[PDB]
DNA sequence: CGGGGGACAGCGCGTACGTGCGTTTAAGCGGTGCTAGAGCTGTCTACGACCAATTGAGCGGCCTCGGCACCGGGATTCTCCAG
DNA sequence: GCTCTAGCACCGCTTAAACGCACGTACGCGCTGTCCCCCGCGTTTTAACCGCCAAGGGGATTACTCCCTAGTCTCCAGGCACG
């Protein structure tokens, strides 16, 4: 065997099985999705680091990413993202 | 307290002087409206970002430091105000 | 007849004088009040130091003037000396907004 | 007598890992300390974006009567959407091509 | 008389075909020869993964189609349809290099 | 061993196919050499960066991972080979 | 009782007197220099961090920031900076 | 000696009560057995309905610049949507009045 | 002494604050939402009972309401509801 | 295999007999296409309900039982086939 | 090779800001009082980070079949032509 | 929680900015001619693609062992506050 090259494989297939049970996935489209998740995670993490340095904060919690989503993602997607992220953090607090 | 329509406070000859610094010889009368519109668009973006910075910091007064942070984010980095 | 120049000569003097000029091109008080107008458009009771108003000022002439070099490069591309709005939004589209 | 290993993503009710996202935040070197809301929130926004774009991808594939998603469908799906386009203006999709965006005067009369 | 399509009709058919198409528009081996040549200009005896050649291919053609989209906007700006070197120079100067 | 002229290996009809993908109907005859030049200049812009990562890695073989990194440094991030 | 603000004040003033002993300096130009030093320092730091990320290096080395100088700093100033940095580390390790 | 109490709504991540709807389906006397996914499914459906209509009602209240929702806002919210119109064609709204609906011939000129 | 009358009070208040934190409530609107949720609940419940009679199943599962919501609820509203319930029941079975 | 037009199999003279049952004495040409349209709409609703029953029945052949069930749900209860 | 489409300049034609100059007014310039909150200081507690263990989902590899790649024939459409 | 300081609020002169009208000149552009230049298609060549086979450079991995680097205690000295 070889070393594991970590990816977002099973996650993209299960979210597709949630949203469209019948359609299939190509390897090229899956690579596109991997690079998309890499890009968006990199953008949000970098801007979270920027707000950490900017407010002289060593701490990055959901509030700074809510700040960053309000920064980067425009408008409709921003408030949508804040909505399901708030639901997610509330179910996290309720475990 | 509340204002409605101060966007013409950036006057037309101010826009003419801006375009003279921008080296525009002839400025049509149609031009001033979309210059005010794009200036509204750009400031709406910048002040949205800056308000988000200040509301993150739990303050009620916008600093110029947060302004130059917003100019770092949007890609118009400005020098000379403590950035 | 009184003294009067041909069209463009005073415009060239204006261009030369304000490329040489370093002082501010726009008025202070309506700019600050417009910043306040956008501020209470988003969150009420928002305050600004004069330095922050200067910073948004500097950003405004930087952004607008840069759009004007892009715009008159578009205008000289179109073989014209008079600029039209389509130059501005086409320039904004090429910039990648 | 340890408790059963139950997943933080299901604690979020989500599928993108709290574990992997928290690990790449810690080892991506972005801050000294990272709050617990950070990876769940960011996994949530990635799952929202992923669900939205695969919704548009599935509709694009069924519009082309095809079953399996292709980067042509992905690229089509991205530039039908204005806020996705504003999000991904400077990003190029592999093998996606260009959506048909034909300017009017060069079309014949 | 053999049938002959009008000038531009086959051009529009090529446009529709290639917008519908997703495949590569460059012969891959002369592209690989060129990228090995220009790599040798900076560092001698470099080796290329075939996937790396494909990645340089797709990034290059994406850059080219972005520039050509910009120059189409420049050409319809100039009341014309034949794209010119001045359009390409304009697009590059607007994009900031 | 050494190669001198492969910029002409990117053929004129291949550039025509690219411009049809760019939606160009009519292409001037002077365009093609300029496209060769600007693609050429873009290849120095990309490949000096890519070679710079490669020589940082103490390696000799160009990889697509460094191609992705070079393209995202210039803000032309390429999906489809990262990860 | 006010707080100390960290700046590049006498350092830029010293190198100014080294390159031009007879000239003066304004505070607005000093803000320009301070933001310039901060911005270029941040650009080099960001590209060095990304380079360390790409090649799985958990430390920042002079070799990879030299790489970053080839990346960000263009052309002839790049090789001047290479000469300056190699000379500087030469007289540093000899010190 | 006992597990700590967790509501089924928190298990499903809903804030409509799963247990209340389960009770009211038991004592609504619709079947002698009810599958466990049925009441949480129904509560999620009503959650989507109420969330949709409270988006609409809050947006309408902002459009008439009033802070509190009123049945007039609700009646504008239902009647300005097509599928809610089919869902509630035969429904009377107290103090909601009627949607602003003027026919084209009733206008002058 | 008073007998408590059950309603849908806190649930509609919480879901409104989750969708609009800055929008208030009037009590007559609150009665309208009470009557709405009661009406749609009894519609779905009666249709489910009729399906259980109709396929001679003695039970109402998630699949019966899945059938019933393409019966009564239209289209995109129904498919969004099916998706919401599907993710809800997967979270329920995971908990 | 697939069929693309059997809506017209409910023919123009057939629609004429159907309206002859309703007492309609003169029928312009514009009515017939909208009658097949609303025929498609109603039967589309009924068969949506019916296939939803049928898929819930875990079978592959439609019976008249779920047909009269769907006519009951839509509100046009049919006598003759119940039970 | 052939050809039609494109580009563009001269002439003209209507046009629209540029600019000179008087007016207004309100920005610009100098002056005063107060407090919002910006910012600094003390408490502490929420909070997050790290480590042994342990497990359980996630990934490397393989195989299958069927959606899709490859193949073939008439229609419809686009276009062009000729009526 | 405190405090203190510059922004907020309010006040009073001063013509510069603005603005608006009017004369004037240049500005864009359409028609149309005119010239020209590249696309469509046919034909010919030729290496691209395929596909098939040998060989070895180095990418990547594992291990080893040592170079190095943050941290901390402490000390002192040059940059910042202040004038």
Residue numbers in the entry:
A (entry chain N), G (entry chain R), I (entry chain H): 30 to 124
B (entry chain L), F (entry chain P), J (entry chain F): 20 to 102
C (entry chain K), E (entry chain O): 37 to 133
D (entry chain M), H (entry chain G): 10 to 118
Please give sentences taken from the publication describing this entry.
Here, we report cryo-EM structures of human H1-containing tetranucleosome arrays with four physiologically relevant NRLs. The structures show a zig-zag arrangement of nucleosomes, with nucleosomes 1 and 3 forming a stack. H1 binding to stacked nucleosomes depends on the NRL, whereas H1 always binds to the non-stacked nucleosomes 2 and 4. H1 contacts DNA with L1, the amino-terminal part of α2 together with L3, and α3 to stabilize the nucleosome and contribute to chromatin compaction.
In our structures, we observe a compact stacking of nucleosomes 1 and 3 that is similar to type I interactions with a contact formed between H2A–H2B dimers. The observed stacking does not allow for interactions between the H4 N-terminal tail of one nucleosome with the acidic patch of a stacked nucleosome and thus leaves the H4 tail free to engage in other interactions. Whereas the inter-nucleosome interactions appear to be very similar, we note a slight relative tilting of the stacking nucleosomes that positions their dyad axes almost parallel, in contrast to type I interactions in which the dyads are slightly tilted toward each other. H1 is absent from the stacked nucleosomes of the 4×177 array, but is present on nucleosome 1 in the 4×187 and 4×197 arrays, and is present on both stacked nucleosomes in the 4×207 array.
